[PDB]
């Protein structure tokens, strides 16, 4: 076994083009809960995604064109540290967003019928 | 090249016409099927399995369906299983006709190609009647089969199966005892049993080498434990013995087809679980639960419990396997496809040792490689 003290760097081995290594900033984040639903199962894992590039309209058929290979590329990580290590070894720039969790709340059904407080509801 | 099946680049070193080495170059039909399957859902990835070995299509579909059902922990109904076995044997007949006649065409005979391809045309008519597609049916699905048989299909399959042994007999009249065919095929591409096992051969390769192994008998799936058939075993381990094994497998497939026709049961054809298999159109247009489940199944799909499985079946070309990895989502995390012809083509160089150019053509034919499944 040999001892080498370097930061891991595999950009020369991944085969990505230089522009797509150097001009790309990924976003490491936990997805925000879709406000149209009350489920919280899509807010468990961290995601890594790239910055949006240009999309234009095809002259024929009017479809949506692109020239960005990394437009649909989304990676799933279990931890912020794992995502950051992956981004660092692949050489991309990255912006990390701290996870937002709902704060604990005090819910009381009996509060709907307060004798002197404004929490008394006018209808059920 | 006519004998290269279209997308094989065989870089050969020849001393005169003697082959010094075979260096197969594949990837000329590599598409990225596994990456695409990662991007699709479980229903959307089924035609990919239709198009891998495009001669045993319902067989590839059946392997994929068995894998997904194993991970889902469900069970197809008996009528669905019997339809699956019947069409797997029909598909085996299609594949063996193709293999034997294309092998003979590479050797130099063409009339058996034409006769047995008329038979292939009739079996294509059966495929088109059940599915609407002549070859890429997408009929066998996780949970059973897509639709039920029309009301004359069993009678027509009976007529075909009744008249097919004579076609096999006529094919054998031109090749089996022909001295030119025997000179071309006898003691060509001999492979020992230990070498076959180490190189990873499966199916008629092993059985020509003399190994008594068949997945339909040893590790049965669907209703293969309720049918009677024999497993042909070769002795010399060469092209002639593998040809005999394939012809006798055609006859045993006729046996299994007769038993399936007689033992076809009544009932539904897909699992009665609307969270996995779609409801009927009338129920969808009448029931709220059925409409919801139709919507969700055809937009998102069903979630498969996390886990990895390797399921193999005895496809006409050998053991065809799927290693499927699910992460609990509606899209497969990983899907490795193990094609029988990959290992056989890997072993082509050893088999063609000490032979000539025409012998190498014969050895390619006896290995019976489809590069759709070799490359994926």
């Amino acid at each position: 076994l040999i001892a080498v003290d370097e930061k891991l760097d595999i950009t020369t081995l991944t085969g990505v083009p230089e522009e797509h290594i150097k001009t790309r900033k990924v976003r490491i984040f936990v997805p925000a809960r879709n406000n149209m639903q009350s489920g919280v199962n899509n807010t468990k894992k961290w995601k890594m995604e790239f910055d949006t590039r240009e999309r234009w309209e095809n002259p024929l058929m009017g479809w949506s064109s692109t020239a960005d290979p990394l437009s649909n590329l989304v990676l799933t990580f279990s931890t912020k540290e794992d995502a950051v290590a992956f981004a660092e070894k692949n050489g991309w720039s990255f912006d990390v967003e701290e996870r937002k969790v709902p704060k604990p709340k005090s819910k009381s059904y009996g509060a709907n019928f307060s004798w002197n407080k404004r929490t008394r509801v006018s209808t059920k | 090249h006519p004998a290269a099946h279209g997308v094989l680049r065989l870089v050969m070193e020849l001393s005169g016409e003697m082959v010094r080495k075979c260096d197969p170059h594949i990837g000329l039909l590599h598409r990225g099927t596994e990456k695409l399957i990662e991007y699709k859902t479980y229903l959307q990835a089924l035609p990919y399995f239709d198009r891998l070995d495009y001669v045993s299509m319902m067989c590839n579909e059946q392997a994929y369906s068995l894998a997904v059902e194993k991970l889902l922990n469900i069970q197809p109904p008996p009528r669905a299983q019997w339809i699956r076995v019947l069409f797997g044997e029909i598909t085996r007949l299609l594949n063996h006709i193709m293999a034997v006649t294309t092998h003979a065409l590479d050797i130099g005979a063409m009339t058996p190609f034409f006769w047995m391809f008329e038979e292939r045309e009739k079996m294509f008519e059966f495929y088109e009647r059940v599915s609407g597609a002549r070859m890429h049916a997408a009929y066998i699905r996780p949970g059973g089969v897509h639709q039920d048989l029309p009301l004359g299909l069993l009678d027509d399959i009976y007529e075909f199966s009744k008249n097919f042994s004579f076609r096999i007999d006529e094919l054998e009249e031109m090749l089996t005892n022909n001295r030119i065919w025997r000179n071309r095929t006898v003691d060509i591409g001999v492979v020992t049993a230990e070498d076959a096992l180490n190189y990873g051969f499966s199916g008629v390769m092993l059985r020509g080498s003399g190994i008594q192994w068949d997945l339909r008998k040893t590790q049965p799936y669907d209703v293969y434990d309720q049918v009677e058939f024999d497993v042909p075993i070769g002795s010399r381990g060469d092209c002639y013995d593998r040809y005999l094994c394939r012809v006798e497998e055609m006859r045993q497939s006729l046996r299994i087809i007769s038993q399936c026709l007689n033992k076809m049961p009544p009932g539904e054809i897909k699992v009665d679980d609307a969270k996995v298999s779609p409801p009927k159109r009338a129920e969808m247009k009448t029931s709220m639960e059925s409409l919801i489940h139709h919507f969700k199944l055809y937009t998102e799909g069903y979630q498969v419990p996390p886990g990895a499985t390797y399921t193999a079946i005895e496809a006409p070309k050998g053991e065809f396997g799927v290693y499927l990895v699910s992460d609990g989502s509606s899209r497969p995390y990983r899907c490795k496809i193990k094609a029988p012809g990959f290992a056989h083509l890997a072993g082509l160089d050893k088999m063609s040792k000490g032979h000539m150019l025409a012998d190498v053509v014969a050895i390619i034919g006896t290995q019976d490689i489809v590069f759709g499944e070799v490359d994926r």
Partner: protein
């Protein structure tokens, strides 16, 4: 009865568990874990440098005659330190059984080639190298098998785009096929399908 539920085989489950304990006892140096999935599949997780000893044992031992290599593949999990997971599927004809052996590695760590144990490992490891970038140490002929000549990158890695980076066309000025950066007339439309509600409680992870 339960017509729509797959029946289980506790006898085979017990046999596989017993053999897993057997192997784990015989090879303490390398075997890290043994599992039996509930559809009766035995899985042995070993240290990456016990590949040759464990495979040779599973091939040559009298009570484990796994003479056939059904498959050899890898799985890419970017969230792990050792992202690549090498999977060996073995078949025992003598005992009519199948086993799985799992190993881990990363980009820069080689795995010993098993062509000295199974001959199918040759093309299987060539494909693993070509598609994932895993290097196999003592391989007779390690080169690309499926990708185009001069293709850069390993397409089966999770961080590789689906359509790649370059595409081919014929250029009349130079009278040859050329490679130019990829550019799609209609971009692949990425669908978000996952439901925000939990499907299987039995696999629920601790909140941590």
């Amino acid at each position: 009865t339960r017509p729509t539920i797959r029946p289980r085989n506790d006898v085979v489950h017990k046999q596989l568990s017993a053999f897993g304990q057997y192997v784990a006892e015989i090879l303490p140096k390398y075997v890290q874990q043994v599992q039996v999935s509930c559809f009766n599949e035995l899985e042995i997780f070993i240290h990456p440098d016990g590949v040759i000893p464990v495979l040779t044992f599973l091939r040559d031992h009298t009570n484990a005659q796994f003479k056939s290599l059904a498959d050899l593949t890898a799985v890419d999990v970017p969230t792990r330190q050792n992202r690549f997971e090498i999977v060996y599927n073995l078949l025992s004809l003598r005992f009519n059984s199948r086993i799985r052996v799992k190993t881990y590695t990363d980009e820069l760590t080689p795995i010993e080639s098993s062509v000295t144990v199974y001959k199918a490992a040759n093309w299987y490891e060539r494909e693993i190298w070509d598609m994932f970038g895993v290097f196999f140490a003592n391989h007779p002929d390690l080169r690309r098998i499926l990708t185009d000549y001069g293709f850069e990158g390993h397409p089966f890695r999770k961080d590789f785009p689906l359509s790649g980076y370059v595409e081919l066309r014929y250029d009349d000025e130079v009278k040859r096929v050329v490679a130019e950066p990829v550019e799609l007339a209609q971009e692949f439309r990425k669908f978000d399908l996952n439901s925000p509600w939990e499907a299987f409680p039995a696999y629920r992870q601790p909140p941590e």
